[PDB]
Design a binder for this molecule. Sequence first.
Ligand SMILES: Nc1ncnc2c1ncn2[C@@H]1O[C@H](COP(=O)(O)OP(=O)(O)O)[C@@H](O)[C@H]1O
Ligand SMILES: [Mg+2]
Ligand SMILES: [Mg+2]
Ligand code: NA
Ligand SMILES: [W+6]
Ligand SMILES: [W+6]
Ligand SMILES: [W+6]
Ligand SMILES: [W+6]
Ligand SMILES: [W+6]
Ligand SMILES: [W+6]
Ligand SMILES: [W+6]
Ligand SMILES: [W+6]
Ligand SMILES: [W+6]
Ligand SMILES: [W+6]
Ligand SMILES: [W+6]
Ligand SMILES: [W+6]
Ligand SMILES: [W+6]
Length: 296
Amino acid sequence: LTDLPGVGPSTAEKLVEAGYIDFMKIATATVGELTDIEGISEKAAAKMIMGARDLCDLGFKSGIDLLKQRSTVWKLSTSSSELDSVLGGGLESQSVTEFAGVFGSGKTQIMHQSCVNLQNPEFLFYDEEAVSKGEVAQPKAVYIDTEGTFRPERIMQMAEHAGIDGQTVLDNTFVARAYNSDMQMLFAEKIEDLIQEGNNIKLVVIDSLTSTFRNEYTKLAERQQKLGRHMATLNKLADLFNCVVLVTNQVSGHAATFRFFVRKGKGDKRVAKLYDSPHLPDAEAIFRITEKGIQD
Ligand SMILES: Nc1ncnc2c1ncn2[C@@H]1O[C@H](COP(=O)(O)OP(=O)(O)O)[C@@H](O)[C@H]1O
Ligand SMILES: [Mg+2]
Ligand SMILES: [Mg+2]
Ligand code: NA
Ligand SMILES: [W+6]
Ligand SMILES: [W+6]
Ligand SMILES: [W+6]
Ligand SMILES: [W+6]
Ligand SMILES: [W+6]
Ligand SMILES: [W+6]
Ligand SMILES: [W+6]
Ligand SMILES: [W+6]
Ligand SMILES: [W+6]
Ligand SMILES: [W+6]
Ligand SMILES: [W+6]
Ligand SMILES: [W+6]
Ligand SMILES: [W+6]
């Protein structure tokens, strides 16, 4: 931190005690959030922010640099060929992907399958010139469980059928049981704390995203508010930590970059329809849910 303009030893200590330890977080901060640190003037805040942006080279980009930026996005396989294709390769890092659907359509299964897949190195697709092997090494997942449906047994079974070690998935997946929207939001805000403690968080799951909010603000206005702050935190986390963020929506409006509607097909079959994305056509993906997890 002292490399930053105006920042000396004591200011660097204050910054780290407020949780601002990397340049990117400072470069993307508002003067307000830094001045609210006290001991940190408004002029010093504007100076270190400008210095941070410069060290992170955050200005206008054009031509080939536009392609380079896009190449920093890596993708996580879903174990379904069809679903991966419709996704343009797999679940994207630096974006929030939402799976909505009726009860039993497979939302929680996909969340569990993703936690397992993260532990199979060959299921993370990336361009080696834009994403280094070290960036996706020892990846870990965070599962914020709002329903009480996380099942370690299911993790073990899906891992076994994929030929990877179940205990290893459990060891590298943090689960937070949230009973209301305050806990759900605080847990999401605390993921930055796990990352600074050395955990390479690369997958964040929120199952469910809207249940607590609907149960508490059954007030679309405020609800939408609190939910908007929650969504901004998820989108920022995805961008800044080059992380895949997945959320489920139990349906019977907000900022997701990819949105699916999953429905039941015959017995085993499920259909996932991508209905919103910034660059892909609407398309349907047929898959199945079996003891092996998600397949086809
Ligand atoms: N061990 C398993 N073997 C085969 N199918 C399973 C297994 N566990 C769960 N499923 C399937 O997943 C369905 C439930 O999916 P789930 O993810 O919980 O739905 P949602 O979260 O959308 O309400 C089940 O009813 C069952 O068909
Ligand atoms: Mg993004
Ligand atoms: Mg569920
Ligand atoms: Na300095
Ligand atoms: W609603
Ligand atoms: W409602
Ligand atoms: W209603
Ligand atoms: W209504
Ligand atoms: W409503
Ligand atoms: W309505
Ligand atoms: W509804
Ligand atoms: W309704
Ligand atoms: W409703
Ligand atoms: W309605
Ligand atoms: W509605
Ligand atoms: W609609
Ligand atoms: W609409």
